[PDB]
Amino acid sequence: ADRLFLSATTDGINYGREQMIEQNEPFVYDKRVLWKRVGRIRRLIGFKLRVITKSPVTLSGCQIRLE
Amino acid sequence: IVARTPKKKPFFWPEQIAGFEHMYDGNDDYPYYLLNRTDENSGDLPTQ
Amino acid sequence: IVARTPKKKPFFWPEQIAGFEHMYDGNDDYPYYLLNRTDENSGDLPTQ
Amino acid sequence: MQIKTKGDLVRAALRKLGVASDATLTDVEPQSMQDAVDDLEAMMAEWYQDGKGIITGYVFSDDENPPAEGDDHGLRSSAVSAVFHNLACRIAPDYALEATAKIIATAKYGKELLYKQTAISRAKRAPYPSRMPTGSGNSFANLNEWHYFPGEQ
Amino acid sequence: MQIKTKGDLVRAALRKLGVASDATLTDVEPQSMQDAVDDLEAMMAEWYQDGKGIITGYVFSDDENPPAEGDDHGLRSSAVSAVFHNLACRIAPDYALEATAKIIATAKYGKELLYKQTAISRAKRAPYPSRMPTGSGNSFANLNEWHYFPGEQ
Amino acid sequence: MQIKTKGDLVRAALRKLGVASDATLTDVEPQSMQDAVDDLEAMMAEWYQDGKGIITGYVFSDDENPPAEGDDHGLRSSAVSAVFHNLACRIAPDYALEATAKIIATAKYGKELLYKQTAISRAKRAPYPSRMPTGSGNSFANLNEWHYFPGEQ
Amino acid sequence: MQIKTKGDLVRAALRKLGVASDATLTDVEPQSMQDAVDDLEAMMAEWYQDGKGIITGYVFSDDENPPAEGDDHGLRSSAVSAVFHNLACRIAPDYALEATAKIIATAKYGKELLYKQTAISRAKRAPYPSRMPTGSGNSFANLNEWHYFPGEQ
Known part of the structure; x- marks a missing residue:
């Protein structure tokens, strides 16, 4: 059950804290990968999706509820 | 009845x-009687 | 009753x-009785 | 009742809100559980008001036990359906969700039946005033020089 | 109670507003925390009215101790659920946010519960007027030359 | 009645909401059934209020037998049409659905019919007060030196 | 209180309006500070109208000190939460911004709380009229030939 690291930038250069979410399970074919709270954005924000695996990784479609 | x-x-x-x-x-x-006003879910339904 | x-x-x-x-x-x-008017959350609900 | 633990209350409230359940594939995140149990403990403190308020079987954690999620609650079987409904109503502003009207109506009903028994038990009539004579029909307190009522004392 | 310090009140208010919590990716800059705790101190000073207004266990910071966030607040466990809800209602104009109706209702309920006990305790009846005779039934104060009530004084 | 077990109640509620039935191609996962039967148990224990509320034939699981979904319920044939309708009305917040107005009206009718018989049976008139003479027309209780009524006691 | 200086009042008002704060990355421009402090001085004169108005501890600058932003104000700790809220309500016309309803409600509450104590202290009953006899029960002012009340004088 490999995990995923995501973080956010406010200035676009250096990143914040890395949150660990599992994105893959050895024999589960249906699961949701999401984070329930991201918080206020002051001026601007950008995300990152570091993954460390030795198994195929597929990601398609990132959506956020802006308000 | 009484x-x-x-x-x-x-x-x-x-x-x-x-x-x-x-x-x-x-x-x-x-000197007087008191009644509370506010409610948690509903706003202020209790009345005088 | 009394x-x-x-x-x-x-x-x-x-x-x-x-x-x-x-x-x-x-x-x-x-010389008179006083009652406050305003509320912090509600506008002016308390009455005369 | 299968809802013995405070974590069961938190999970039931979250499932009612639609945040995390099994009817939706999402799962509970531990920090959400911690925030919700803190909110539950704070809300249950206000209702009690040290007795003067709603009286329900509830044990407040002294924080000697580090994890407050696992410990048991003394809630009787009737108050459970109200406590987690009110908790789910209160958690919704933490996210951007708003509770459905059915949850609000159920919380109202639950609190009303929570307080109705105590309201019945606390409706007592004051004794006779101090300057109230006892009539000549008693015939025993009248013969014992006990003519007037003691009063409210 | 896990909300011992003033900073805990500020963080609870921010979590209730949804701006920032422990599970959020972006966090609030400390100067905003300083502003929020200053606003909390100002709001608590306005309710006390110097002994005349709402009375609750609260200790105002000294200034001889630099950090006003760290020092503990003498709030009893029942007042917490009201204080940070009102703080979250007041902080909303600082950002572009507006408090949800549930938070407003909770703040109303909390302030009502804060003041109800003091309202009960302060409902006292004034003594008899100065020119009010005591009847011939006392038989002791009447025989001690003290025929009339003393007065409000 | 073909609705003997609690699981039958849960499945009837789910069918009424349209989420899942026998003729559907997708079904509900058993953990949601467990959650729904727990919710049904909680709701039914809030109507009973320990013998002081709505009284209907119902047996609570003792938790010694593991599956509370499989065991029988003591509901009479008339109360079934109310219990699962109310259960379906309560379940919809768990999903994203909202109960149709027809289901709400049916639940109202069912609860009213559930409580009408107990309301009839519980409308009793209190005995005579303590200080009430029995008139000279009884001729037997008057001759037995028992002139006054005993009282509510 | 950490809001000792008039500049602190101006900064708090601007932060409440959302013009310049740290929760919004903007910074305060000095001419805005000067305009806001001039408006604050003007507003707090119309309130204490030479004494016959709202009485609060406040020192009006004689302009001997050129920079009026840095000097202290004599506001008591309870009036601060009202003064800067009213200032923030007044400043918004300077820009195209409109104050939020929460700020307006808080300003109303603050002004009412400011004036209630003076209203209590100024509610005095007038003395007896000049042509009112003092009855024969005084027995001392009656013997001192001072039969009638002196008057309002």
Whole structure:
């Protein structure tokens, strides 16, 4: 059950804290990968999706509820 | 009719007098009667 | 009925008389009775 | 009742809100559980008001036990359906969700039945005033020089 | 109670508003925390009215101790659920946010519960007027030459 | 009645909401059934209020037998049409659905019919007060020196 | 209180309006500070109208000190939460911004709380009229030939 690291930038250069979410399970074919709270954005924000695996990784479609 | 008929007393909700329940017993130690107003889910339904 | 019945006294909210609580005891020292108006969350609900 | 633990209350509230359940594939995140249990403990403190308020079987954690999620609650079987409904109503502003009207109605009903028994039990009539004579029909307290009522004392 | 410090009140208010919590990716800058705790101190100073207004266990910071966030607040466990809800209602104009109706209702309920006990305790009846005779039934104060009531004084 | 077990109640509620039935191609996962039967148990224990509320034939699981979904319920045939309708009305917040107005009206009717018989049976008139003479027309209780009524006691 | 200086009041008002704060990355421009402090001084004169108005501890600058932003104000700790809220309500016309309803409600509450104590202190009853006899029960002012009340004088 490999995990995923995501973080956010406010200035676009250096990143914040890395949150660990599992994105893959050895024999589960249906699961949701999401984070329930991201918080206020002051001026601007950008995300990152570091993954460390030795198994195929597929990601398609990132959506956020802006308000 | 005189014996078994209930007397005259006000109709209160259990939460219109949530507190202040020792004021309506007839002790006659307070200058006025109190009723709470606000509610958690509903806004201010209890009335005077 | 004469003995145990509560007397006649007004119904006040605890915050209609937030202050001014020494005016309603019967001291008879002020020319009028006062009631505060505004509320922090609600606009002006307390009344005369 | 299968809802013995506070974590069961939190999970039921979250499932009612639609945040985390099994009818939706999402799962509970631990920090959400911690925030919700803190909110539950704070809300249950206000209702009690040290007794003067709603009286229900509830044990407040002294924090000697570090994890407050696992410990048991003393809630009787009737108050459970109200406590987690109110908790789910209160948690919704933490996210951007708003509770459905059915949850609000159920919370109202639950609190009303929570307080109705105490309201019945606390409706007592004051004793006779101090200057109330006892009539000549008693014939025993009248012969014992006990003419007048003691009073409210 | 896990909300011992003033900073805990500020963080609870921010979490209730949804701006920031422990599970959020972006966090609030400390100067905003300082502003929020200053606003909390100002709001608590306005309710006390110097002994005349709402009375609750609260200790105002000294200034001899630099950090006003760290020092503990003498709030009793029942007042917490009201204080940070009101703080979250007041902080909303600082950002572009507006408080949800549930938070407003909770703040109303909390302030009502804060003031109800003091309202009960302060409802006292004034003594007899100065020119009010005591009847011939006392038989002791009447025989001690003290025929009339003393007065409000 | 073909609705003997609690699981039958849960499945009837789910069918009424349209989420899942026998003729559907997708079904509900058993953990949601467990959650729904727990919710049904909680709701039914809040109507009983320990013998002081709505009284209907119902047996609570003792938790010694593991599956509370499989065991029988003591509901009479008339109360079934109310219990699962109310259960379906309560379940919809768990999903994203909202109960149709027809289901709400049916639940109202069912609860009213549930409580009407107990309301009839519980409308009793109190005995005569303590200080009430029995007139000279009884001629037997008057001759037995028992002139006054005993009282409510 | 950490809001000792008039500049602190101006900064708090601007932060409440959302013009310049740290929760919004903007910074305060000095001419905005000067305009806001001039408006604050103007507003707090119309309130204490030479004494016959709202009485609060406040020192009006004689302009001997050129920079009026840095000097202290004599506001008591309870009036601060009202003064800067009213200032923030007044400043918004300077820009195209409109104050939020929460700020307006807080300003109303603050002004009412400011004036209630003076209203209590100024509610005095007039003396007896000049042509009012003092009855024969005084027995001392009656013996001192001072039969009638002196009057309002």
